[PDB]
Amino acid sequence: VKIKIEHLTKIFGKRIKTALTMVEKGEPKNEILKKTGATVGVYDTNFEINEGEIFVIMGLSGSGKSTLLRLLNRLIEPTSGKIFIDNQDVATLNKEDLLQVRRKTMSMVFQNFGLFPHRTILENTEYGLEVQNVPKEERRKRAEKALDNANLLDFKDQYPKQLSGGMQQRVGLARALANDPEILLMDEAFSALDPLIRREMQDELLELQAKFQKTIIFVSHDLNEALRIGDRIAIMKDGKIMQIGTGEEILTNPANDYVK
């Protein structure tokens, strides 16, 4: 296995330890988020992600689905928990080791494409390397190959504002890929596209994964697209994982009608 989680916890607001332990009683989060006012992101999630798979993550919009991601790479400081990768726990790292992690191992993809409008394609896509102090020629070549693998090297001098939602997403994915990461995080990557280009990006992602294998984590809200991508799906609600079913999620329905 490439990833191993151990009791991941994220709680906002003050009363850090007091609220953490008072909720550690295991009560439904609704009570503490409604009355006591202590917001909750997750609660004691202990799962894992094996190499060369797709651990999709569902959850109604507002159920702490992307917070788990943003915790994996520490875009939000997790209260307590452990994320063992490459025999390394991330939460117990200084800025240097964490930066090297983010540089070489993990890299995200964003809903609104998280693109620098003031920088052109061959300028953005190379960011993942520019940050690494990479030879301009080498990073340029890597960017251009990451582009032509998506068939956009022709537009290597335009600006994002002059492109399409699907093209912007493909450029974001090229930026994520040029760094050649062992892990690929995707947070609602296709939540702003049309169904047909959505499905097209899905097929592109699958063909690339099958061709180039690497661990993927994926957030989404449709079960159909998921099962189209789902190698190990795991839905979430109230900030709590409930299952890790590939073809059984839709079979077994533990305390959930949303599964249909």
Partner: protein, 272 residues
């Protein structure tokens, strides 16, 4: 009746200007040399070649509109004909240095205020405290330390023009959409690659508005510092309102007005 303060203040000021004179003499030397260097050598060159440069630059930033170029030419040339070119080269090095110092001091402070929220909660009300008060009272802390001269005018200007730069910097930094910051942090940007590559290039347009306010505030403050001894056109104005020679005072005031219009139109058109 009790009147204790004045003594305490003069005592503290003597203590400072005595125990730190090592720094104040150096600052005085640097200020005077910078002024008499970039006002006589970097400037004070043919007064028919500089107004032409500025005219064509106005043409560039204006395209087809000829009003502003006609003003620059029938302006600066007007000054020169009136014999006030050497007092405009000064009053420019002064606003130049004041703006540069206010920038160097604010932009960093603006970053520091954008990162930490308590720093902002501290300073922003302090900045309104410093932008509401009259600027004439920024002269005491100038003649008390650097006496009269140029560097006190510069100090008054930098401490009078600083607020807007800081405020608009903080804005342009903590108004760039958090998603781009997430993107830049996911690829391991250590707050120095992130800054230059993402935030400044996006804040620029907001910051430079604060700076184009800073410049006008510095102009105002050096004209006011003319009371101290900060050279330039201000002195002229001053002399006039002291001797009621409305001709000299009016020509110097119109020169200042011309300089102000020019600086405003430039610093605006070079922001959009």
């Amino acid at each position: 009746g009790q009147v204790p303060i004045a003594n305490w203040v003069s005592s503290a000021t003597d203590w400072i200007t005595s125990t730190f004179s090592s720094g104040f003499d150096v600052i005085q030397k640097s200020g005077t040399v910078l002024m008499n260097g970039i006002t006589g050598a970097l400037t004070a060159v043919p007064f028919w070649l500089m107004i032409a440069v500025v005219t064509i630059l106005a043409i560039l930033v204006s395209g087809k509109k000829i009003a502003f170029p006609l003003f620059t030419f029938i302006g600066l040339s007007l000054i020169a004909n009136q014999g006030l070119w050497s007092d405009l080269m000064s009053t420019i090095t002064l606003v130049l240095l004041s703006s540069l110092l206010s920038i160097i001091i604010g932009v960093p402070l603006g970053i520091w205020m954008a990162k930490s929220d308590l720093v902002a909660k501290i300073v922003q009300p302090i900045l309104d405290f410093m932008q509401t008060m009259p600027g004439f009272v920024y002269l005491i802390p100038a003649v008390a330390f650097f006496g009269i001269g140029v560097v006190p005018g510069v100090f008054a200007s930098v401490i009078f023009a600083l607020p807007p730069t800081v405020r608009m910097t903080n804005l342009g930094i903590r108004q760039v959409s958090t998603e781009l910051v997430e993107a830049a942090d996911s690829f391991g940007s250590t707050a120095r690659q992130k800054l230059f590559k993402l935030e400044f290039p996006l804040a620029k347009g907001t910051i430079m508005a604060g700076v184009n306010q800073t410049i006008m505030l510095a102009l105002s403050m050096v004209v006011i510092a003319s009371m101290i001894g900060a050279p330039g056109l201000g002195r002229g104005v001053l002399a006039a309102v002291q001797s009621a020679d409305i001709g000299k005072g009016f020509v110097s005031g119109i020169s200042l007005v011309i300089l102000a219009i020019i600086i405003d139109r430039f610093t605006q058109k070079l922001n959009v």
